[PDB]
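Second attempt. The first submission of Endothiapepsin had a stray character pasted in from the spreadsheet, which I only caught after the job came back as garbage. Lesson logged: always re-copy from the clean sequence file. Corrected sequence (330 aa) follows.
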Amino acid sequence: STGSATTTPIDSLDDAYITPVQIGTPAQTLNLDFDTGSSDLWVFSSETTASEVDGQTIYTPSKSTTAKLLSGATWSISYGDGSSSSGDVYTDTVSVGGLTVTGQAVESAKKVSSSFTEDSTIDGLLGLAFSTLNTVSPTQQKTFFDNAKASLDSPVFTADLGYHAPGTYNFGFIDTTAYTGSITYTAVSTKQGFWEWTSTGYAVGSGTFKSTSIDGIADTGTTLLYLPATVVSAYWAQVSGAKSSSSVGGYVFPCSATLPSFTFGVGSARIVIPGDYIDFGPISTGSSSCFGGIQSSAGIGINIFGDVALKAAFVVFNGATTPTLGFASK
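This time the job returned cleanly.
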């Protein structure tokens, strides 16, 4: 089997991407944030505290004839961005672009943090990291990809995120028309539950490529590119007027600047992020200072190849017996 769904930026800055997901019988369609950095499928729901729902579409398990309460199961997750949610658990039928899993754990939110409430465009998350990170207690549950794997034509899913445009998540097959050149595959460590890999280095604009190992995660659920402070300083040093702003919380730059591209290595291959992908717009409405899309990972503990990086490539999440990651230019 296969599946294919269109993923769409939530706003004019590509702050995140949403993909429609059918849940229950009859189907309830919610727009979920597909997140290769976490492993819980959770949804706004009829059980969510009413003051914490502000425009999202909710899942109502009582209206799904295939929903079953998972007895005694709860979940609670806290994300790197400081947001959180928690609730109980149903199993139900979940379909993504024609690919169907029965018995998928659907984590129904009773509580969400303020940032989720304030974002009316994201109805929940669909985790695509490794199921070892799933938070359901006392019985950990499997991701949608983990449940679907055995039925897929190939045990893979691909992310093809657009810049200011729609893109695609495919399950079970590689669309060879969706990229140029070849896909370079690189090794993955699952020891922390992430699609963790090692980039072979970087270049800024037209500058010399620096060979240096950058260990980080392919994370469709993080907006920006978070890299070591040495690398990030070298990038922003090429932008006249850029500086690290403590009050804003990272590097900012004059909105009138034209940004250089940023290249990262995948083996001997190179992925070029165009400069405009690094512009995240005025720091506050009406400001002429703009927020940078490449930021220091120094306070994180891990480098994150977020949407800024991934949307420059066609990305293969290969769930073979030994998982690997594939990157192609597009």
